[PDB]
Amino acid sequence: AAPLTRYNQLLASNIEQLTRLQLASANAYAELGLQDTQSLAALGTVQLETASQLSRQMLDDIQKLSALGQQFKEELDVLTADGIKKSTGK
Amino acid sequence: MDVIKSFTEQMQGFAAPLTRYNQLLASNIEQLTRLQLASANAYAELGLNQLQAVSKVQDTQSLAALGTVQLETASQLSRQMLDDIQKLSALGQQFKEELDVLTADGI
Amino acid sequence: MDVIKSFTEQMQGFAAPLTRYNQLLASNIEQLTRLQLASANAYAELGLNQLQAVSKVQDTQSLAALGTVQLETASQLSRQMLDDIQKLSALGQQFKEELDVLTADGIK
Amino acid sequence: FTEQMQGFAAPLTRYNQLLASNIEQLTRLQLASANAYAELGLNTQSLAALGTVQLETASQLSRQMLDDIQKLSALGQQFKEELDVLTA
């Protein structure tokens, strides 16, 4: 469990969102591919601005993830220090 | 005749910025995938080497060797976890950057 | 005005099949991603449980936890790997399938 | 017995690699298509041909994907035969 899972989840999460973005883009090209240069400049602007927002959120989730990861490394350092004490055992 | 038309479309400059955008997306998808593959391979190598390790401790009695395996696997786990988070943060930064260049040049 | 135009495009049927192809690809990328995440979480869980088990040791009589978690971890990892291969084969099989209906319908 | 653990590492990576293989390639497909349309945006039999060629590309990637899944599953199944023998 723990931030390990949380991190793989954020990873896959971002992959998915980006794919849906590339799909939105591809569809938007095929349409119109079928007063229009106003809509072209608009399209480039809009897909830039959507990707931009997604990058904002990805970086926020990265920051929070780093926090939960702080909790976990606190938990792991106790496990490695128990390992050290036992390792001096025999 | 392919070359002239590709040059002139390259000169008009209409498909180039959009292709830049798609290209950028595909790249970040690729880099995220490779991060997930590396994480997965790391967790696998941990569980496997801990399994062989606990087996070689099975065929002895020293609780010290057991503790040394515990120490190694926990320490390397923290290692891998923090380095993975950092890799990801870098990926997110460089993506924000490339996007700001593309919006900037768009104007 | 959005509705009439999308109705007439869906009726012409020129942009629809290409969009179907793009949707096919996007869906398989999604499913492959989720399959990989599941695999990753599996290796993570099995590793971490065996770590907590090895941390619960001390007292040499604890070789029972050693053999039981080791046997459990090994056989369950067999399962995981084989079932993962099956999910992936299924995904590739079904991908083939939808491609063949799209080629078939594209011909006609 | 611990010897057998070597035989986990081959398919596991081979599995994980394969997954990511298929993801990359699919994304390139999604990319090529996504800018193929884009070229036609700057500009009707070219459309039919474009669809045919996308469907064919993806089909070939599919054959390859299914052959690699065959080889992998053979590795895993041989390895399971040996493991089910070793627990006996």
Author numbering:
A (entry chain C): 17 to 50, 60 to 115
B (entry chain A): 3 to 109
C (entry chain D): 3 to 110
D (entry chain B): 9 to 51, 62 to 106
Mind quoting what the paper says about this structure?
PHAs are stored intracellularly as granules surrounded by a layer of phospholipids and several types of granule-associated proteins including PHA synthases, PHA depolymerases and a group of proteins known as phasins or PhaPs. PhaPs are proteins that bind to the surface of PHA granules, and can be regarded as an interphase between the cytoplasm and the hydrophobic PHA granules which functions in preventing granular coalescence. In this study, the crystal structure of PhaPAh has been revealed, and a mechanism proposed for its binding to hydrophobic PHA materials.
PhaPAh native crystals diffracted to 3.0 Å, as observed using the Shanghai Synchrotron Research Facility (SSRF) BL17U beamline. The overall shape of the tetramer somewhat resembles a flat rectangular brick, with two short N-terminal helices from chains A and D protruding outwards from two opposite sides of the “brick”. The still exposed hydrophobic regions of the stacked A–D dimer then recruit chains B and C through hydrophobic interactions to form the tetramer. The recruitment of chains B and C leaves no hydrophobic region exposed to the solvent environment in the tetramer.
